[PDB]
UniProtKB/Swiss-Prot annotation, chain B:
It comes from Saccharomyces cerevisiae (strain RM11-1a). The chain holds residues 2 to 207 of 252 of the full protein. The lineage of its organism: Eukaryota, Fungi, Dikarya, Ascomycota, Saccharomycotina. This is Small ribosomal subunit protein uS2A. Its main location: cytoplasm. Keywords: Acetylation, Cytoplasm, Ribonucleoprotein, Ribosomal protein. One of its GO terms (molecular function) is structural constituent of ribosome. Belongs to the universal ribosomal protein uS2 family.
Swiss-Prot record, chain C:
One of its GO terms (biological process) is cytoplasmic translation. It comes from Saccharomyces cerevisiae (strain ATCC 204508 / S288c) (Baker's yeast). Keywords: Cytoplasm, Ribonucleoprotein, Ribosomal protein. This is Small ribosomal subunit protein eS17A. The keyword Glycoprotein does not apply. The lineage of its organism: Eukaryota, Fungi, Dikarya, Ascomycota, Saccharomycotina. One of its GO terms (molecular function) is structural constituent of ribosome.
Curated annotation (Swiss-Prot), chain E:
The gene is RPS14A. This is Small ribosomal subunit protein uS11A. It comes from the Eukaryota. PROSITE patterns: RIBOSOMAL_S11 (PS00054). Residues 118-127 have a biased composition (Basic residues). Component of the ribosome, a large ribonucleoprotein complex responsible for the synthesis of proteins in the cell. The small ribosomal subunit (SSU) binds messenger RNAs (mRNAs) and translates the encoded message by selecting cognate aminoacyl-transfer RNA (tRNA) molecules. The large subunit (LSU) contains the ribosomal catalytic site termed the peptidyl transferase center (PTC), which catalyzes the formation of peptide bonds, thereby polymerizing the amino acids delivered by tRNAs into a polypeptide chain.
Amino acid sequence: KFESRKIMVPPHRMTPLRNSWTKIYPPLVEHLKLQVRMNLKTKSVELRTNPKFTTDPGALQKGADFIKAFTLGFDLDDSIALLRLDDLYIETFEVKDVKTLTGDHLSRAIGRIAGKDGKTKFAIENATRTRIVLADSKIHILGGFTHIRMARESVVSLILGSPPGKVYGNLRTVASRLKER
Amino acid sequence: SLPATFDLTPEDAQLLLAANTHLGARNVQVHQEPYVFNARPDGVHVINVGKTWEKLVLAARIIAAIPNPEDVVAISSRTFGQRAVLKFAAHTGATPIAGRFTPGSFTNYITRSFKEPRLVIVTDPRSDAQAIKEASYVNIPVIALTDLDSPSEFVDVAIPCNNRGKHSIGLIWYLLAREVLRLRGALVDRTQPWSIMPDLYFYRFP
Amino acid sequence: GRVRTKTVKRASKALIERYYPKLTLDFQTNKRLCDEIATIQSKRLRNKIAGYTTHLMKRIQKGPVRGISFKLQEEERERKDQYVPEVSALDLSRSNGVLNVDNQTSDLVKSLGLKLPLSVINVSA
Amino acid sequence: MTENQTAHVRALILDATPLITQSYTHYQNYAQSFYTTPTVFQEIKDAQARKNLEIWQSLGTLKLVHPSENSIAKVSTFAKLTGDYSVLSANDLHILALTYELEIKLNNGDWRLRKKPGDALDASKADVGSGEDTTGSLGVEASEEDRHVALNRPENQVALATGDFAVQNVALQMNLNLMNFMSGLKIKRIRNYMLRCHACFKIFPLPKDGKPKHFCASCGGQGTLLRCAVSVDSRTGNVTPREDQKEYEKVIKQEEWTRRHNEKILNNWIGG
Amino acid sequence: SQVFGVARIYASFNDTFVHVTDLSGKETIARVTGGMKVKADRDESSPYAAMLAAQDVAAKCKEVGITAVHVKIRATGGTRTKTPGPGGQAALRALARSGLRIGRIEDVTPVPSDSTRKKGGRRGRRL
């Protein structure tokens, strides 16, 4: 009653894969009780199960979700939060899907979601229980629906070109009645 | 303006090629192009070691030209450099600066690290660049050990060597020490080798 | 927090950089030790200094601390010269008397005009 | 009907890798006496390895022997001469010292051991009586009397069973007998990767932590270190193929503190 | 050995569809919406509604007897987004959690070569 899933390894993250793989595999192999095989040539990771493992069918989907998380820039502490919780999910979205921007407009939108020393990114991870990774044209937010929904409202404020001060004011407003309840 | 005995003795040339001083960096500045002879074709240049010998002969003449031997100051912050300058300061009586050179030491007479030199030797002009620029304020000649990609500004009589390896820096400090003691008069015979071996200046990490 | 004052700390630093060996792990001997060596005006302050020297005797016996001790500083005065090798790496016998030199530096040797035991080695890329 | 495979080695020094990979039955047909260090046995933490260690302790064939301090000093001097002391552990040095003491006791002298690397062996005292090239030990159909004569030879008195390439290079520098953990044949040559300076041509071993050296130890050239395969012959003993900134030490200490904090966070995640 | 189904997950911002039939799209077997499982209009696309809806689809597939299933997931595609929303991810978690065998997981989202104009205008569409 085996089951194997196939997943793709990005080239931009295979060097931290071989850097921190020693911290990646033994928590899931010990606590979550799975089997991992590499294919370093064909950018593939084999996540396999066995009847000699524990019967837990949903943690195979969870393990494919950990490697899908690690596909898109995500560190290992968010993998610990994905180990412990279940309400935390993943999202991608595009810069062009809100507003048609080109070139330096795209660069200034990436600068607006990034900010000076990543401070508006810091303000959006700490006040919303979200975690932020910026790609070239992809935005990535983890978490639950009440958390990521106000993260949606903030990021479509910010990528529309609203100033970050109004983002901070609306951010602490939604954080205020977030921690109020 | 020098006698013919002063040139490259072949055991010193064997000593120079033993310490890999002729190997250098990959970038060649506009200023230090005559020190390179040609390039071994990976990206490593080889330097004219006769220029290094005669250039340190100049630096030895600068050090011997001062009247007070305690007024020359050696500067170091590289890990090999502290041992090299403490041996040089032990053997010629110079004032060493080991480790962190204190800012405001060449101006600002208040600080107890205020020494005014008339002559300054520096291990490299990039990591010890602050002693270079503070000596640029109170009119001090600086003779220095520059690589092939060292900053060449604010130095005069700069000795091309290798500051990367401990062999070359310990040897080149040893040769400056033996050149100035053979020029001052502490070792009368030019034929006689100096009694201390160059491996005293060499760094070991236990 | 019971952070001790700087006078007790500095007096203990001076009395341990200078008067190391007769101080020990016993506070009661250290009390009349700092009575017999130091002129401290009060019983309370000399108790502070004697207890602090007792505590620095407690952690000095496990290893070295950043401050000055004599019995190490003779040792880095022969660390400067005790490990001189009888044969260095710059001597001839470590390469059997003939150097490992490329073609260009042998051209430097034959162009400058010196005679030297060189072995030409061919290197590429 | 299995043949009576006689032991070709009187005593074999077993590492944690051969104790974990192979059972006592795999090493029973090759060696007569089993010797090991107590720290290597205390370092074993796997459950199947603990069961195999309990089975070996019930068998009683394994001898827990600590090496002598003078042999430890000689092994440390040999490792400092060969430059392998930075990568070798203290347990590896103790295992090499115990192997040297067992070879000194078994052969009644140190004529078969080289004090320095590249020194010729004293052959005048012999008449007084995975990248490993193990070729030449195959095709030997020795009889029982031939196996007894080979076990009576001083070359097969002591063997070192280990998986550490630095320890294998130290034993090849000491001209010690090396045996495969799975095959049991005597190692003749070993091929390993070593860091070579591209300018100074200085040879250094691979790092234990796996981090690449940004500056060479002797050359100092940025990127001058290259991965070079080196072969070591047991008969000859010849291996055939900046950092001075305080900010660099601060970066190394920050990387070590980050690794320690990550290990603490991983331990809290495992134990939470 | 077993029988594989052909599954579709359609993940908008405001609902989810878990919709499965046999091979080649012959006749639809199970059919749920986000609106039928939670009557609250704020929770049409909730992961709770997604998992309960996919659990009812799994119950339908178990009573018709299909054990293996092949799934493709999609967004709306076109001028709107490309990767599915988290309701699809919770649907995947539910169908794997249900004990039903899974065959293949891919992303058949209808991707344009070159799209037309979206429904926002020049300025933007979201808030």
